[PDB]
């Protein structure tokens, strides 16, 4: 890909392939030129070393990138490792319809409720708001609905309050030591930027209000919402899976 300002960025596999092709071509030329045995043998050794470096690097000499001391990235280094495809892209992918913020106390809530800022809810539920606006006849085209949402009119707030009625969300804290680190709540729209968390679930989450942060995910499909409401709700997880003792004791 080209970079802004006339600069370019490329992968090491390109230079490895270039090296392999160049050495193969030179060996072919030498063979066609009737060169002495020593030159042909050295060219063969160079070709074999280049192929070995291309396939699995760091086994013989660990060729380093040009103009730098960092070693090249071989084909085998992409698949394996903690940063390879298997562990970095096949199990830990980034996702849409999500966000995070700082958590607060909010002692007035019910055990199945949370506090969600208006801005986060609007930006997470945009497509639902577009659909509702088009359905209700307020906006003729999706562009008009987008403009209305961007202008933040009162009808937009009413439509959001209607579309967030019984749609649960998932809250997650960074170190997920057990399955109680993810639970589903029913959002209650508030003004501000911090998420309000019921006091009784802090022990399960292991959360304290001195700078902690949490993430929110939105289940999209209908079966996803049913699973969130019937399996992950905060009022369904009262006993500890490790032992039948309750986990919602006042702290």
């Amino acid at each position: 890909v080209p970079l802004d300002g006339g600069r370019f960025a490329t992968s090491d596999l390109n230079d490895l392939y270039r090296r392999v092709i160049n050495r193969n071509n030179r060996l072919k030329r030498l063979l066609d030129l009737a060169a002495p045995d020593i030159i042909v043998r050295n060219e063969k050794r160079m070709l074999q070393e280049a192929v070995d470096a291309l396939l699995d690097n760091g086994r013989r000499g660990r060729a380093i990138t040009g103009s730098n001391k960092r070693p090249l990235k071989s084909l085998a280094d992409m698949i394996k490792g903690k940063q390879g495809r298997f562990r970095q892209n096949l199990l830990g992918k980034r996702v849409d319809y999500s966000g995070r913020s700082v958590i607060t106390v909010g002692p007035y809530l019910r055990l199945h409720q949370c506090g969600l800022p208006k801005k986060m809810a609007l930006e997470l539920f945009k497509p639902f708001i577009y659909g509702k606006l088009e359905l209700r006849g307020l906006a003729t085209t999706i562009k008009a609905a987008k403009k209305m949402v961007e202008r933040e009119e009162a009808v937009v707030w009413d439509i959001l309050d209607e579309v967030i009625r019984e749609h649960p969300v998932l809250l997650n804290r960074a170190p997920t030591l057990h399955r109680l680190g993810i639970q589903a709540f029913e959002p209650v729209l508030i003004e501000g930027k911090a998420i309000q968390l019921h006091p009784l679930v802090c022990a399960a989450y292991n959360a304290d209000f001195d700078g902690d942060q949490m993430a929110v995910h939105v289940p999209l499909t209908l079966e996803a919402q049913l699973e969130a409401r019937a399996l992950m709700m905060s009022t369904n997880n009262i006993l500890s899976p490790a032992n039948g003792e309750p986990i919602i004791v006042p702290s």
Binding site: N42, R45, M46, E49, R60
Partner: peptide, 13 residues
């Protein structure tokens, strides 16, 4: 020999 894998050393030898 040291069983070195460097082609440079072999060629020089």
């Amino acid at each position: 020999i040291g069983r070195t894998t460097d082609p440079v050393r072999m060629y020089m030898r």
